[PDB]
């Protein structure tokens, strides 16, 4: 176990902070909200996204030809 | 009560500490309060006064904390907050 004392050395860092009842908990929750949100979803769409719509294609024409190769399977038996 | 009678007291002796009380009393109560008054006043609280007072300005209240040195065990401000007021009254 660690317990705060014999964590770790830190010089020289100033660090002013605020009474929880002397401000807002929810600042500027939509003005600065959403467009972070916007922000981090670009960041990340380019890994995340992709990886998800080869599965959905694979997904969408794989039922596809689980059907056409049955029922679509006759088909011609002509004679 | 006891302490500060003798605090007061002993404060005041000698030309220069009176002469500061003089000057400075003018400034912030406007007049030059006897020792008797100080007295009076003291003598007036007990138990009940404490209390009261004592909750007036600490109870639930929020706190100006300043730290500098190896302060990493210094609790984290919501903490000492909590610590402003008890669960058990």
Known sequence: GRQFGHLTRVRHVITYSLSPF???????YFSKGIPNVLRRTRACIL????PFVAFY??????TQEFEKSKRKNPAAYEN | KNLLRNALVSHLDG???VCEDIGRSLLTYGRRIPLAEWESRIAEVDARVVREVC??????????????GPIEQLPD??????????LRF
Request: proline share 9%; glycine share 6%; net charge positive.
């Open chain 1, 57 to 62: 294609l694979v997904y969408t024409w794989g």
């Open chain 2, 55 to 68: 909750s007036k300005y600490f109870y639930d209240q929020c706190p100006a904390v300043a730290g500098f």
């Open chain 1, 22 to 28: 002397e401000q807002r908990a929810f600042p500027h």
């Open chain 2, 15 to 17: 030309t220069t500490p």
């Open chain 2, 77 to 86: 401000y919501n903490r000492i907050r909590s610590g402003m007021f008890w």
């Open chain 1, 47 to 50: 890994r995340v996204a992709p």
